[PDB]
Amino acid sequence: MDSKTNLIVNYLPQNMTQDEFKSLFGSIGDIESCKLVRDKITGQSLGYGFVNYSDPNDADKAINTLNGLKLQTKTIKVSYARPSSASIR
């Protein structure tokens, strides 16, 4: 069905984690399913998580407001979750 629910976040700050990542994109749209990067060994974050909204309108809004957030000493930025470029030559 036409919907497009791809919201990949990157540039996550240390404090940000599975809990700070849920509330962050949680008070913006019904993330049909979140999924921040969280190794299954020590638990170090890769500095980016995955999020899928329910509609494309709520997803473009999380990007029209969180796309380029400034931090005390870091730069966070939202980005549509897309697959590899898939090049050839």
From Swiss-Prot:
Phenotype reported upon loss of the gene: RNAi-mediated knockdown results in reduced Gap43 mRNA levels and impaired learning behavior in radial arm maze training.
GO molecular function, one term: mRNA 3'-UTR AU-rich region binding
Domain RRM: 5-83
GO biological process: cell differentiation; nervous system development
Superkingdom, natural source: Eukaryota
Key words, A-Z: Developmental protein, Differentiation, Neurogenesis, Repeat, RNA-binding
UniProt subunit comment: Interacts with MAP1B light chain LC1.
Protein's name according to its UniProt entry: ELAV-like protein 3
Gene: Elavl3
Entire-sequence positions represented here: 36 to 123 of 367
